[PDB]
Design a protein around this motif. Structure first.
Motif, PDB file in Angstrom:
ATOM      1  N   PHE A 110       4.460   3.755   2.590  1.00 56.00           N
ATOM      2  CA  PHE A 110       3.861   2.615   2.969  1.00 56.00           C
ATOM      3  C   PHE A 110       2.423   2.524   2.876  1.00 56.00           C
ATOM      4  O   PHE A 110       1.886   1.451   2.903  1.00 56.00           O
ATOM      5  N   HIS A 111       1.529   3.492   3.075  1.00 55.16           N
ATOM      6  CA  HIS A 111       0.206   3.654   3.003  1.00 55.16           C
ATOM      7  C   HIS A 111      -0.201   3.183   1.831  1.00 55.16           C
ATOM      8  O   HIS A 111      -1.261   2.572   1.704  1.00 55.16           O
ATOM      9  N   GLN A 112       0.478   3.516   0.699  1.00 56.83           N
ATOM     10  CA  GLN A 112       0.028   3.406  -0.761  1.00 56.83           C
ATOM     11  C   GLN A 112       0.635   1.840  -0.978  1.00 56.83           C
ATOM     12  O   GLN A 112      -0.317   1.037  -1.501  1.00 56.83           O
ATOM     13  N   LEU A 113       1.709   1.321  -0.341  1.00 63.41           N
ATOM     14  CA  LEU A 113       2.007  -0.163  -0.868  1.00 63.41           C
ATOM     15  C   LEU A 113       0.900  -0.927  -0.116  1.00 63.41           C
ATOM     16  O   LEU A 113       0.592  -1.981  -0.581  1.00 63.41           O
ATOM     17  N   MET A 114       0.602  -0.536   1.061  1.00 66.80           N
ATOM     18  CA  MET A 114      -0.497  -0.966   1.725  1.00 66.80           C
ATOM     19  C   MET A 114      -1.954  -1.228   1.126  1.00 66.80           C
ATOM     20  O   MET A 114      -2.534  -2.181   0.998  1.00 66.80           O
TER      21      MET A 114
END
Ligand SMILES: COc1cc(-c2ccc3c(c2)NC(=O)/C3=C\c2ccc[nH]2)ccc1O
Length: 268
Positions: A110-114
């Motif tokens: 999720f951090h990367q998608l963000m």
């Protein structure tokens, strides 16, 4: 069996679809592996243009969380999209049906998608179709937003450009796309990332669509978290969803504020 494109050998099909086909192209000479999307244009009303925008967008994009765009060629009808290869596959195949994945891995992806999303938004580009089938993982297992066929610019010369064209995928599109004429581009992606956080945490899709009539969506609108998929999710990360899958696209949490969420900054 084994074809090739301008000095590159076509190993296998990475993905297909009425879109055309994407074969993994690698050249035994250098052996650098790459993704080659072969857009099979037809006439001058569908493919022969839904790709002109697609290629332009790419040449703008350059971020460690956006499948890189090497280049493009064009015989005439068949066009070649040279793209970055992500051995890892799709995030989709790391979600166990009805179960999900370990929370720490959800948080990381999720951090990367963000990371990748905020990036795109920065240069005024909205993806419009975020989902596990478009979030690829590579060798080192790093999330890279993918498939820009439906993307589009919403900010040019620092001037927003509200959107109205409906498109994306039903069990991931934000509610405003159904009840409204025009809607801000960024909140649609945030909602779509939110639905992607749920799959990773519950291994299932909350509803078929955010239709005010879809019984399952009405139950989430009635804080009935005492039911699937919300029950398989932990209250912490559930607190963020409560702020993401928010109906009024005006009151929805913004990417920036998502970075200040407790679950988000929870060492896991
Ligand atoms: C940068 O924007 C794009 C990415 C892809 C795309 C679509 C699928 C794959 C890929 C790239 N790279 C891969 O490695 C893909 C598939 C795959 C399947 C299993 C492992 N990989 C297609 C069109 C685009 O405009």
């Amino acid at each position: 069996a084994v074809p090739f494109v301008e000095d590159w050998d076509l190993v296998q099909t990475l993905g297909e679809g009425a879109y055309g086909e994407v074969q993994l192209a690698v050249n035994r000479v250098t052996e650098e592996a790459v993704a080659v999307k072969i857009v099979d244009m037809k006439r001058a009303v569908d493919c022969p243009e839904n790709i002109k925008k697609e290629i332009c967008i790419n040449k703008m994009l350059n971020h460690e969380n956006v499948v890189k765009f090497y280049g493009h060629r064009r015989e005439g009808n068949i066009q070649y999209l040279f793209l970055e290869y992500c051995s890892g596959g799709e995030l989709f195949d790391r979600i166990e049906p009805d179960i999900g994945m370990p929370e720490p891995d959800a948080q990381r992806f999720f951090h990367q998608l963000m990371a990748g999303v905020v990036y795109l938004h920065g240069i005024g580009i909205t993806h419009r179709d975020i989902k596990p089938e478009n979030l690829l993982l590579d060798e080192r297992d790093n999330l890279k937003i993918s498939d820009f066929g439906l993307a589009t610019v919403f900010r040019y010369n620092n001037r927003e450009r509200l959107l109205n064209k409906m498109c994306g995928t039903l069990p991931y599109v934000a509610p405003e796309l159904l009840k409204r004429r025009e809607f801000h581009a960024e909140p649609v992606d945030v909602w779509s990332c939110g639905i992607v956080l749920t799959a990773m945490l519950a291994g299932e899709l909350p509803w078929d669509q955010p239709s005010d009539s879809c019984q399952e969506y009405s139950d989430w609108k009635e804080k009935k978290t005492y039911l699937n998929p919300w029950k398989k999710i932990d209250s912490a990360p559930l607190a963020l969803l409560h702020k993401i899958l928010v109906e009024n696209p005006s009151a929805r949490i913004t990417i920036p504020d998502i970075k200040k969420d407790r679950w988000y900054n929870k060492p896991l």
